[PDB]
Structure formats: structure tokens, C-alpha cells
């Protein structure tokens, strides 16, 4: 736990501006950007931090699942066609069965996680053979060799706050990427790589303003 208070250690998102006082910069990925001041009170602050982390991780997974199969279609062996139209793809089972199974299992898991949030340490999975003392928690970073078997979130590979900063920044970027992909498919009728190459060929004209 390292703090990033005002000064050179605090590169303000808006140069020449004093960041909101209740934005200390402890949470990695902070730059003093909350003009709406939603993080005014601490309970809301931590709640929004958890929401941000979850959104970032899910958005990373979603953008990977969009990107990789489409390029492996374009040039790779197997041809995974339009992902936006894969939502209605036909499988062995009906979409509602898939939906209810997803909801059951994810409700189980996310409910256990919800109780962990409301009551830290009271719902954890970390066995204890004798004489080896286990690690604690920092909710949002469960620890133990279930979700950190590489021993990366604790020390050695990088000071923690730096790696969490990497994570939150990449997650914000991935959120932008997902909303961009979706909005493009709303407007255009291709995948992300197709729009990409179309822009590469004609950067000067092949844009949103092409029509």
C-alpha cells in the first residue's frame, strides 16, 4: 500500500488543476478525475472501485473473445464469422437453457463473492495445513494459490500498486474498445479488423465521415 498524494507524484489528468481533495490517489489508476464528485463519500468510493475492477476484467475477456476469433478467421485456418451475429448462432441447445444455466452458476459464484464483499474473510477458500500461515485478503485481490498461483500480486515481480495500475488502465481501455466495437456494428456491418483494414487503405477518406 503506497499513497500518491498531490505534487509531481500526482500527474493531474487536467494540467494546472488541483484535484478534488477526497481523491487521494491510493487506488491505482487514479488521476483526480471526478468532476461529478460521485466518489464523495468513502462507501460509495469503494463500491465504485469494485464495480470498476469487475467491469474492467469482464471487458478484457469480452474484447479478447471478439478480437482473436475474427482475426483467426481473416487469416487463420478456422473462419469464425461475425461475432455480433454469433449471438443468434445455432447450437445443440436453445438459448434459454443456456441462459438459465448461466444464471444459476453465476448467481452461485457472484453471491459467494457478494457475501465476501459484505463480510471480508468470512467467505474464503484457502486451505491450511499445520504451521504454514495463510495470507489475508484485500477484497478484489483474493490471494492464495487459487487466483494468484504465479505469486504475482504479492511483491516480487512488481510493486503492487504499479501492477494494479496496469490492470485498471488496460481495463478502461478495453471498456472503450468494447463500446466502440458494439457502436460500430450498430453503424457498420463488419468486424473490427475489417474496419481497421478499411481505415488503413484509405485513411484520408474511409472514416465515419465517408458517407
Partner 1 sequence: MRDIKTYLSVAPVLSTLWFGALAGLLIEINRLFPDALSFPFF
Partner 2 sequence: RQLWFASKQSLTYLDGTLPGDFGFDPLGLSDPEGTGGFIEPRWLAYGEIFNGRTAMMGVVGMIAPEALGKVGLVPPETAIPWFQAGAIPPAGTYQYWADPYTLFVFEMALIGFAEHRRLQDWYNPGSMGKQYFLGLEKYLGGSGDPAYPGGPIFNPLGFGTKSEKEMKELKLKEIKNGRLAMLAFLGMSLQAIFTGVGPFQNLLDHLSDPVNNNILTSLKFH
Annotated binding site for chlorophyll a: 31, 33, 52, 55, 57, 143, 166-167, 170, 172, 184, 199
37, interface contact from ligand CLA, partner 1, partner 2, none, CB < 5-8 Å by kind: partner 1
Question: Based on CB atoms, which residue is closest to partner 2, 28 or 56?
Answer: 28
Per-position DSSP letters for 4-50, written without gaps between them: --SSTTS--SSTT-PPPTT--S-STT--S--TT-TT-SHHHHHHHHH
Q: Least distance to partner 2 from the beta carbon of 105, Å?
A: 45
E strand or H helix at 51 = helix 42-74
Half-sphere exposure of 76 (CA within 13 A, CB side): 11
40 makes contact with partner 1 (CB under 8 A): yes
Per the annotation, binding residues are 31, 33, 52, 55, 57, 143, 166-167, 170, 172, 184, 199
Residue identified by cell 462507501 is 43
Q: Which residue do the cell numbers 504475482 mark?
A: 152
Is 87 a binding residue for partner 2 by CB under 8 A? The answer is no
User: Could you list the residues that contact partner 2 (CB under 8 A)?
Assistant: 8, 11-12, 14-17, 203-205, 207-210
Amino acid at each position: 500500500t503506497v499513497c500518491e498524494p498531490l505534487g509531481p507524484d500526482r500527474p493531474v489528468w487536467f494540467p494546472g488543476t488541483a484535484p478534488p481533495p477526497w481523491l487521494d490517489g491510493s487506488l491505482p489508476g487514479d488521476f483526480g478525475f471526478d468532476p461529478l464528485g460521485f466518489g464523495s463519500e468513502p462507501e460509495s468510493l469503494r463500491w465504485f472501485a469494485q464495480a470498476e475492477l469487475m467491469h474492467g476484467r469482464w471487458a478484457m475477456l469480452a474484447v479478447a473473445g471478439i478480437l482473436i476469433p475474427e482475426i483467426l478467421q481473416k487469416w487463420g485456418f478456422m473462419e469464425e464469422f461475425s461475432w455480433y451475429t454469433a449471438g443468434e448462432r445455432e447450437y445443440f441447445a436453445d438459448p434459454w437453457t443456456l441462459f438459465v444455466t448461466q444464471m444459476a452458476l453465476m448467481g452461485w459464484v457472484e453471491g459467494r463473492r457478494w457475501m465476501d464483499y459484505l463480510n471480508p474473510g468470512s467467505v474464503d477458500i484457502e486451505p491450511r495445513f499445520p504451521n504454514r500461515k495463510n495470507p489475508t485478503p484485500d477484497v478484489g485481490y483474493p490471494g492464495g494459490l487459487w487466483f494468484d498461483w504465479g505469486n504475482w500480486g504479492r511483491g516480487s515481480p512488481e510493486p503492487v500498486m504499479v501492477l494494479r495500475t496496469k490492470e485498471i488502465k488496460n481495463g478502461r481501455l478495453a471498456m472503450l474498445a468494447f463500446v466502440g466495437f458494439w457502436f460500430q456494428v450498430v453503424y457498420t456491418g463488419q468486424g473490427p479488423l475489417d474496419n481497421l483494414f478499411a481505415h488503413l487503405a484509405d485513411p484520408g477518406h474511409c472514416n465515419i465521415f465517408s458517407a
